[PDB]
Amino acid sequence: VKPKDRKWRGIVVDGKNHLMGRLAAVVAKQLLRGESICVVRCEDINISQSFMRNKFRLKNIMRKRHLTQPKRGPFHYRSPRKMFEKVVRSMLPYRTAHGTAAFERLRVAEGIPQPFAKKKRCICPAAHRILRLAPNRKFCRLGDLCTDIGWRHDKTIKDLEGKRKKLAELRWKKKKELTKLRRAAERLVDRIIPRIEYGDPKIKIGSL
């Protein structure tokens, strides 16, 4: 991991199965409240409507260009991570000092790179697609939309994620064995010193 990211500490949010704008808004409010957040797996973020509807929405968005010089015009990113960063930017007051401080606390990433794969990632219940969208309703995928408008790196990240998942499975099995024998150690000590629990009327000044 590069030095500046070795220095990194914060919360890691699994962006998979999340509604894009609700995610963005939760992340934005928390960044303003001063949290550092890294929204990981931005290709697996969900958007609330049909694939074709969102494809046409992105088409009409990218229609907007500065006619005198486009290289100065609205930038329309092909990466899911960068699209998400722009939605979060829009939710933030990025044209102030505290607003740019929040936006620089934002730490969006694609796939799951290393400083964040070494960390416990969470999910926002509000903004979660399963917990929010009715099953009746349709939804799309940000990586699908981004490969539709370009973004040649979907499969490149799919392979890397498969590799990461194999390593994670190895570590998960080792962790299962270690938690087995850690319960073993706990019971071995439960023989020596019985665990005193909160549900006890014995804990008092005439006892103890």
Binding site: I205, G206, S207, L208
Partner: protein
């Protein structure tokens, strides 16, 4: 099941308190008695906690639900001699404008404050000075030394029968008071009874 009315949570003699601030943060002490309204004499024993005979605001301590049954212990202390005033020439900065309330609520305070004594030259506090920065420093050292030695008398006079009582009561209380109270990430003060 009875909610009951609201009461003023207040320290009682023999109640385990938790100091909220000062040199001894979060240490558990035993409230001995009240000196002034809202100011209490405590000591988590200098052998148990390391907290000497001390005073505390009712506002910088948590009143836990741990009562020690301090019954039958000699808690008599020369509070004025032990704790000096530290503000010499008590109430003279301007010539007294008169105390011109004549019977009640000025006289009943002025007489009640002319009753108490004054920490005399040894048990009082020493205001600072230079005297070549040392003729005061050394004498202050031995003044402090003899004052501490005079306070140790009463402190042990309380703490020798007070430890013999808490060990007599149940032996884990000494380690209960040796342990310091801290907040961790999963402790929510607005939900913690005491």
């Amino acid at each position: 099941v009875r909610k009951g009315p609201s009461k003023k949570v207040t320290p009682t003699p023999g109640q385990v308190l938790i100091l909220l601030s000062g040199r001894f943060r979060g240490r558990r002490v035993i409230c001995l008695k009240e000196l002034e309204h809202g100011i209490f004499l405590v000591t988590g024993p200098y052998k148990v906690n390391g907290v000497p005979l001390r005073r505390v605001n009712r506002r910088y301590c948590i009143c836990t639900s741990t009562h020690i049954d301090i019954s039958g212990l000699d808690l008599n202390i020369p509070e004025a001699q032990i704790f000096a005033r530290r503000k010499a020439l008590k109430k003279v900065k301007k010539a007294l404008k008169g105390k011109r309330a004549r019977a009640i609520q000025e006289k009943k305070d002025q007489a009640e404050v002319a009753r108490p004594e004054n920490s005399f030259l040894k048990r009082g506090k020493k205001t600072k000075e230079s005297k070549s920065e040392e003729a005061f420093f050394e004498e202050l050292k031995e003044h402090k030394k003899k004052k501490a030695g005079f306070k140790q008398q009463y402190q042990k006079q309380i703490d020798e029968p007070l430890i013999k009582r808490l060990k007599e009561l149940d032996p884990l209380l000494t380690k209960y008071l040796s342990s310091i109270f801290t907040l961790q990430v999963n402790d929510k003060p607005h939900l913690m009874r005491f």
